[PDB]
Every structure is written in C-alpha cells, then in structure tokens.
C-alpha cells in the first residue's frame, strides 16, 4: 500500500513553533510535490504550500510565507512543516498530501490536530457505563464509556482493541468551558455480555494517557 503517515496531535503555547512530520511510503518520493493544508473543524481546506521533493523547491500561499517552512528528508522519505509564531487561530487539522501531474492529490495523511493554547493538558477521567439491574432483557445490550474533562482534543475510543467495530457510536466531544467530554456506546448481542469481557480503550495523545475500562455488571 502507498501511505503518508503524520505526527501526533499536539498542544502548543501561543508564540511557540511546531514542526510537523509526514512520513511517506509506497510511492516514489523524489517526484512528489508534498503539499500541506489547513482545515478548521467544519470548514473548507486551505492550501499552505508545497515542496518538490526532487529539488527542495517550495511554493507558498502568500498568506503563510514567514509563517511556514517546508523541508524534506529524501533518505527517510519524510516531509516537514515548521509553523512559527503560533496564535490560537492556528488551531486546526493539518494535512500533507502528494500531488503529481498524472494523479492529482491522490494520497493524503491522516491529519494532525494542533491546538494553540496557554492551558496545560488535562487527562480524561474514564467511567464504565453498565446498565442497572432492570434493563437489558432482550437480544441486544448497550454498554457505554464516559470520557470526561480532558484537554485538548482529541481522544480515540475503541472497544476490545478494535475487535468490536459493529454497533459502535462515539459521540463528538462537547466543550464545557475549558474541558471536553465525550461518550461512546456499543451494542452487542446478549450472547456476548456479561459472559465475555467488553473493555473500552481510551487514548489521549497530548497527555500520553491510555486507559482500559472493562464493563462489569453493576452489583452496586
């Protein structure tokens, strides 16, 4: 497979700078025009600049010159964007994408969420949501996980390490003053729970937090 792998979500202070990475594989790096784009949640994409990996030649959106700096490392097929003098308005998702005259922007990285804030990271409190001695009684049973009071975004939530993909609904985080809260639900056949273990996995990059919360029948 051909792939563009971006660096993790970062929280950075106003006035600081970040260096984003974009590791590539599966395609010829030298002939690649690696582009970087900015996307504010629920808005269109903004093109920042591109760099021809073959020459190191760069072309910038005049609105980002003196702000962004692109480089490339041909030996490791990795592209970098150094963004400086960050302001809270620079908080957004940043993508790297490969262009070629014969393919357009065919390859895209997964995006890196950059948060520019003076506040420190607050890891989330993860709570297992089990039904009480009263519901369930049916063919399907819904369990949940509450991911409360964290900063900044995002958090990733999987169930049984990705083994349970079906029946999952992870809700968009909601900002409460200065902290986010999110929840996820999974519906499994009663055949599955409580006989077997259902654990929700929550990862919060910015604080290097990884929690596993097993859902146990509430005896209390």
């Amino acid at each position: 497979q051909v792939k563009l792998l971006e660096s993790g979500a970062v929280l950075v202070k106003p006035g600081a700078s970040v260096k984003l990475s974009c590791k590539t594989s599966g395609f010829t790096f030298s002939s690649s025009y690696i582009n970087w784009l900015k996307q504010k949640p629920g808005q269109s994409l903004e093109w920042i600049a591109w760099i021809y990996a073959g020459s190191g030649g760069t072309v910038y959106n005049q609105h980002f010159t003196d702000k962004a700096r692109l480089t490339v490392d041909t030996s490791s097929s990795t592209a970098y964007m150094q963004f400086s003098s960050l302001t809270t308005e620079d908080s957004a998702i940043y993508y790297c994408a490969r262009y070629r005259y014969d393919e357009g922007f065919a390859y895209w990285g997964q995006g890196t969420l950059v948060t520019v804030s003076a506040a420190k990271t607050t890891p989330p409190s993860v709570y297992p949501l089990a039904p009480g001695s009263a519901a369930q009684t049916n063919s399907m049973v819904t369990l949940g996980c509450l991911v409360k009071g964290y900063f900044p975004e995002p958090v990733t939530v999987t169930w049984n390490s990705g083994s349970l993909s079906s029946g999952v609904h992870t809700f968009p985080a909601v900002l409460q003053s200065d902290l986010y809260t999110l929840s996820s639900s999974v519906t499994v056949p009663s055949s599955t729970w409580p006989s077997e273990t259902v654990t929700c996995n929550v990862a919060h990059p910015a604080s290097s937090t990884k929690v596993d919360k097993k859902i146990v029948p509430r005896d209390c």
Partner: peptide
C-alpha cells in the same frame, strides 16, 4: 430511537 439510561459509575461517585 432505542433509548438506554445509565446511572453514575461508582468510581465517579467516590470522587
């Protein structure tokens, strides 16, 4: 909608 209600986790009540 299939509605589901969940009471507070005991871990949270402790906090």
């Amino acid at each position: 909608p299939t509605v589901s209600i969940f009471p507070p986790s005991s871990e949270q009540l402790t906090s």
